[PDB]
Amino acid sequence: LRVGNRYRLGRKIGSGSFGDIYLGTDIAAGEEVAIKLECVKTKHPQLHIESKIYKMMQGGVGIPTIRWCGAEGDYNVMVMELLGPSLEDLFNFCSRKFSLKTVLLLADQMISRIEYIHSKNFIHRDVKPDNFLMGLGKKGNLVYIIDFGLAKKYGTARYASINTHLGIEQSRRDDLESLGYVLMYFNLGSLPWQGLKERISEKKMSTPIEVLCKGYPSEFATYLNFCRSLRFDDKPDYSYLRQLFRNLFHRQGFSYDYVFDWNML
Numbered sequence: 158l159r160v161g162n163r164y165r166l167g168r169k170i171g172s173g174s175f176g177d178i179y180l181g182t183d184i185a186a187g188e189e190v191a192i193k194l195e196c197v198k199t200k201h202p203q204l205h206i207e208s209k210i211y212k213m214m215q216g217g218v219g220i221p222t223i224r225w226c227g228a229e230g231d232y233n234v235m236v237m238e239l240l241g242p243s244l245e246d247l248f249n250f251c252s253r254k255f256s257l258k259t260v261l262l263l264a265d266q267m268i269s270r271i272e273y274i275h276s277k278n279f280i281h282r283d284v285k286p287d288n289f290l291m292g293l294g295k296k297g298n299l300v301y302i303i304d305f306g307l308a309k310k311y312g313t314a315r316y317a318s319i320n321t322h323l324g325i326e327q328s329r330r331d332d333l334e335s336l337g338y339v340l341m342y343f344n345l346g347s348l349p350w351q352g353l354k355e356r357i358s359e360k361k362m363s364t365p366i367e368v369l370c371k372g373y374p375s376e377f378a379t380y381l382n383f384c385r386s387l388r389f390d391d392k393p394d395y396s397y398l399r400q401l402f403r404n405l406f407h408r409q410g411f412s413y414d415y416v417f418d419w420n421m422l
């Protein structure tokens with residue numbers, strides 16, 4: 158199917174917040190792309206608002222390039238460069254187990270992605286593994302951050318901060334606290350409040366950070382304690398948090414070579 162004079166629409170990949178994702182080809186450039194579709198007539202149009210956020214974020218490391226934006230038939234269309242699998246897909250492919258080196262390589266980039274979004278006056282509000290994608294080819298070592306559908310100028314229950322479960326307005330600290338649960342999720346293979354059948358808020362609040370992080374380097378606990386200590390309007394010390402993991406990376410004797418667990422398959 159023809160899209161905006163130069164794109165050929167392929168099949169559905171998955172779904173984002175407020176729209177389905179499809180494979181595509183940029184016919185003029187000879188490159189595969191990813192296409193997000195939104196019904197023109199939806200009660201709450203958001204595709205064009207999100208495109209403006211991506212546009213403002215352009216130039217930042219690990220911010221995907223948006224190639225075209227417009228309307229075609231029954232849909233609002235956004236075209237993005239093709240990226241690789243999400244960290245959730247890669248975690249599942251690695252049998253839900255990442256080495257400490259992989260977790261630390263990912264933490265370094267992920268803290269930087271969040272800091273960049275915050276430097277652009279936005280909070281993401283949905284920090285989770287499926288919102289981080291690895292690049293392809295020459296950009297294969299790069300962690301990209303996606304989905305600005307829930308973003309706000311200053312989510313998922315499993316990774317929500319305690320302040321979020323309390324019903325408090327999300328701020329910079331909440332994006333970082335979510336990353337801290339994402340990091341522990343990669344370390345454990347699961348979180349203690351996962352698969353409960355409300356109950357998540359109670360389980361999170363009754364699980365001390367020292368119990369959550371037991372058997373893992375103290376840095377994961379120190380990271381979460383720092384995020385929980387941040388005030389609503391506080392500018393987080395991103396450099397301190399990256400240095401916490403960097404010092405542990407050096408103590409372990411690891412090389413910053415971008416060779417992740419999946420690269421060894």
Ligand SMILES: CNCc1cc(-c2cn(C)nc2-c2ccc(F)cc2)ccn1
Nearest residue numbers: 172173191192193235236237239240241
């Ligand atoms: C997973 N690799 C294919 C892939 C998927 C995506 C992708 C995923 N999700 C949940 N959303 C998007 C997306 C695609 C286009 C767009 F305009 C806005 C967002 C992106 C690139 N490459």
